[PDB]
């Protein structure tokens, strides 16, 4: 039950300011290092920022030098990223991970072996926005749901309320160049069963309340 | 700062394969490397550090090694659960870089996409703009390419792309594309058609349809 837990993350507009906390328990903090690392969508691992067990010293990553500043507080058990003017760039799940760094175990044990969960930052100008869904009309037919201009992430798609989930394949949205996400759901049925069977995306935005019900007929 | 690159950038394999993926740096960094696991939707997870040290609770079936500027990960039995993407990195100077990743897929027959394209819809119209969506449905591997043409003239730079992650069940792919115009556009047009390139098919294939039949 050593655990580091992430919290902090929102949508923030562009130039503006945003902190993470990444509270640590189950183990000595004190002993550790610790890093951010981030994960872009659709992106790999990079690595944000380190601070020593005793918040010695810190270095940064060269893209987020002078606007991030790394720290720690040892009696409380938490580590803390201070992120100013944030970019369209810097929007991802960011994550904490503990380094033992040779206080453990071995001299040359150094990794980051214990991570939170991520938390995600989201930097844009845009209003939060439901979607407008439209159907994508149909042995065997296509069809689908066309989840467009929603903000901001994420939607849940369901077929039939849960019910059909085979053939179902509902694709990563796509950040559109007006700031608002797209995305499709499409299903393969047999084609007999059109007209003998209904279908209907379900549809749900939490952060707009939103939540829409669309038959997909031929 | 120390660059890191890994090699390939996705393999192929199967359970029971002996899987080997590679890393360099731009530099000499010793013992000082990392690999680490990651699965779709979730933290990474340190698997070896020192370069060949195993990180404790990871299966024996993984092992790494090199110093200086190269270095392996290899599974010497792939099992199920280490289809992922690995990463290395390396701690020897700040700041701390990652290599991009490889991913360790699911290999399969060469299956060729399924294609459907679909008008926008009348409720779309309505309100003044057209998506226009062609699918590529259930093929492997992972290379797909999609092409829009309107009346017969090549597009560019109104079309998005999205691909699945493979799935579960017969490890394929699918791929959306949407074509966007403006409702005007859109009408001033007859033949709208996705043509698909894709090692399963012979030559291109080519979905169309009239605008209005």
């Known amino acids: 039950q050593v655990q580091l837990v992430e919290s902090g993350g929102g949508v923030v507009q562009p130039g503006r300011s945003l902190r993470l906390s990444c509270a640590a328990s189950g183990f000595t903090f004190s002993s550790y290092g610790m890093h951010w690392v981030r994960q872009a969508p659709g992106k790999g691992l990079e690595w944000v920022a380190v601070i020593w067990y005793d918040g010695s010293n810190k270095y940064y990553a060269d893209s987020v030098k002078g606007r991030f500043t790394i720290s720690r507080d040892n009696s409380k058990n938490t580590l803390y990223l201070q992120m100013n003017s944030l970019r369209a760039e810097d929007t991802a799940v960011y994550y904490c991970?503990?380094?033992?760094?040779?206080?453990?175990?071995?001299?040359?044990?150094?990794?980051?072996?214990?991570w939170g969960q991520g938390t995600t930052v989201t930097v844009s100008s845009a209003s939060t926005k439901g979607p407008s869904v439209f159907p994508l009309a149909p042995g065997t037919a296509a069809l689908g749901c066309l989840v467009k201009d929603y903000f901001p992430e994420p939607v849940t798609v369901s077929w039939n309320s849960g019910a059909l989930t085979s053939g179902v394949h509902t694709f990563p949205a796509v950040l559109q160049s007006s700031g608002l996400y797209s995305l499709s759901s499409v299903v393969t049925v047999p084609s007999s069963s059109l007209g003998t069977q209904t279908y209907i995306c379900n549809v749900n935005h939490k952060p707009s309340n939103t939540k829409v019900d669309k038959k997909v007929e031929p | 700062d120390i660059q890191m690159t890994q090699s390939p950038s996705s393999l192929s394999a199967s359970v029971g394969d002996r899987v080997t993926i590679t890393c360099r740096a731009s530099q000499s960094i010793n013992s000082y490397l990392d690999w680490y696991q990651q699965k779709p939707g979730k933290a990474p997870k340190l698997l070896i550090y020192a370069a060949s040290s195993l990180q404790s609770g990871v299966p024996s079936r993984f092992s790494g090694s090199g110093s200086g500027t190269d270095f392996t990960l290899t599974i010497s039995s792939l099992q199920p659960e280490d289809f992922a993407t690995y990463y290395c990195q390396q701690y020897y100077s700040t700041p701390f870089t990652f290599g991009p990743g490889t991913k360790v897929e699911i290999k399969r027959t060469v299956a060729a996409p399924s294609v459907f394209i679909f008008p926008p819809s009348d409720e779309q119209l309505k309100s003044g703009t057209a998506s226009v969506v062609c699918l590529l449905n259930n093929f492997y591997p992972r290379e797909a390419k999609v092409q829009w043409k309107v009346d017969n003239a090549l597009q560019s730079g109104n079309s998005q792309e999205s691909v699945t992650e493979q799935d579960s069940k017969d490890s394929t792919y699918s791929l959306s594309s949407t074509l966007t115009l403006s409702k005007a556009d859109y009408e001033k047009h007859k033949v709208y058609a996705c043509e698909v390139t894709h090692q399963g098919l012979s030559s291109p294939v080519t979905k169309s349809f009239n605008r209005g039949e």
């Open positions: 991970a503990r380094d033992p760094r040779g206080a453990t175990l071995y001299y040359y044990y150094y990794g980051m072996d214990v």
